[PDB]
Amino acid sequence: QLIPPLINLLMSIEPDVIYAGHDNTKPDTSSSLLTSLNQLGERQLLSVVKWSKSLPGFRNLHIDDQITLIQYSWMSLMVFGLGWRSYKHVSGQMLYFAPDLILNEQRMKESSFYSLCLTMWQIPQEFVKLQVSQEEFLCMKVLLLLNTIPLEGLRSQTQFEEMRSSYIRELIKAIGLRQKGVVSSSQRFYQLTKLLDNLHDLVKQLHLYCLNTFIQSRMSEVIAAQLPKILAGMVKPLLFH
């Protein structure tokens, strides 16, 4: 019938359209395309922060926990959002970074980062195969913000665990909206959470690309800074399987 209140609340705090400030009425160069993406990334970061403060439970956490979670989640959140837009607007056939920045297959190949494109393109394809709902996407997204904590843990550890548990229950409610039956629901939950778990690996790849693209545009200080985001055993991932 109706949509659960929390999920409806999630829909209403979804960030509105963010343009890249890209001119499509003129051919792109390797310089302008990368410049457009960085500008979009900066704008999307401020949006992630603004979105997190409207998230029930997030403000209860110590300011230091809030910072940490965003540091360990911005990449995942950005590529997951890209996955959703590409899925909804163009059936996952191309990368919908923004309304004024859509990369089709032929353009991805001509670029100097087709490999990265194929990696990111994995998500929209998965959304198509699973036929993910908006309600499911919204709950999964919050779970990404709460999927990695430091080895020592957080200051508001108990408050965090409770928040994580609430959104897990919400995802189950989202699934229940269409999956009627305990066997089908259980099977759906496994598929969606398996997808969430796989993002831990995929995101390390994106961080490496970012680190390698930096090196190419320009020493041990730079390496050491990003290492914790590409290497295993540095942080504590929260896996469902």
Binding site: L45, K50, K53, I63, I67, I70
Partner: peptide, 11 residues
């Protein structure tokens, strides 16, 4: 300088 930006944005 992301940590700084994230912190200022949160406040």
């Amino acid at each position: 300088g992301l940590e700084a930006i994230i912190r200022k944005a949160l406040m």
